[PDB]
Amino acid sequence: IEKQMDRVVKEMRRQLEMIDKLTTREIEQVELLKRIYDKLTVQ
Amino acid sequence: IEKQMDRVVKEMRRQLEMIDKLTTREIEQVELLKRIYDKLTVQ
Amino acid sequence: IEKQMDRVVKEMRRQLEMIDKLTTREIEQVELLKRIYDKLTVQ
Amino acid sequence: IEKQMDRVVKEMRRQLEMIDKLTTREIEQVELLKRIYDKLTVQ
Numbered sequence: 064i065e066k067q068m069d070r071v072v073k074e075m076r077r078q079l080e081m082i083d084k085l086t087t088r089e090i091e092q093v094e095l096l097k098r099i100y101d102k103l104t105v106q
Numbered sequence: 107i108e109k110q111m112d113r114v115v116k117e118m119r120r121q122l123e124m125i126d127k128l129t130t131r132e133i134e135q136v137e138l139l140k141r142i143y144d145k146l147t148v149q
Numbered sequence: 150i151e152k153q154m155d156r157v158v159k160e161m162r163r164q165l166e167m168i169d170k171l172t173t174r175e176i177e178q179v180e181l182l183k184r185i186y187d188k189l190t191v192q
Numbered sequence: 193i194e195k196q197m198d199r200v201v202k203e204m205r206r207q208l209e210m211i212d213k214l215t216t217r218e219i220e221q222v223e224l225l226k227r228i229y230d231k232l233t234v235q
């Protein structure tokens with residue numbers, strides 16, 4: 064069963080790398096949203 | 107296999123931190139989107 | 150070790166429920182984004 | 193524990209499907225955000 068647990072650890076870390084990237088992309092969306100809102104506010 | 111099991115548990119704790127971040131950022135984004143839509147729509 | 154694997158299955162399903170909710174929320178963001186873009190396009 | 197291990201593998205496959213969706217939707221959102229920002233900015 065150690066062969067299977069080995070595959071699980073590897074896949075979890077691969078999927079986490081993907082979620083990590085997603086997290087970075089979401090930060091950009093927030094910053095872009097704030098910029099868009101400012102273009103719509105008098106200043 | 108206890109060593110492998112420990113690795114799995116720590117990856118899950120790491121993943122939880124990431125989901126928490128995605129969840130809170132998602133809220134910030136949607137609230138921003140609604141505000142932006144309102145700035146463009148007849149009130 | 151069955152006690153630990155039991156906790157892993159439960160936690161994975163709990164975290165997936167969270168990702169499932171996130172997925173639904175993201176669909177809304179896309180639909181909201183399309184509506185915002187249309188308010189900015191002549192028609 | 194092989195039965196529990198199988199449950200874990202299937203949850204991971206389910207999670208992957210979800211991450212794939214989040215990843216593709218995120219792209220659609222950012223491209224929309226950039227287009228919206230452009231519609232509001234001097235070109």
Ligand SMILES: [Sr+2]
Pocket residue numbers: 089092132135175178218221
């Ligand atoms: Sr988003």
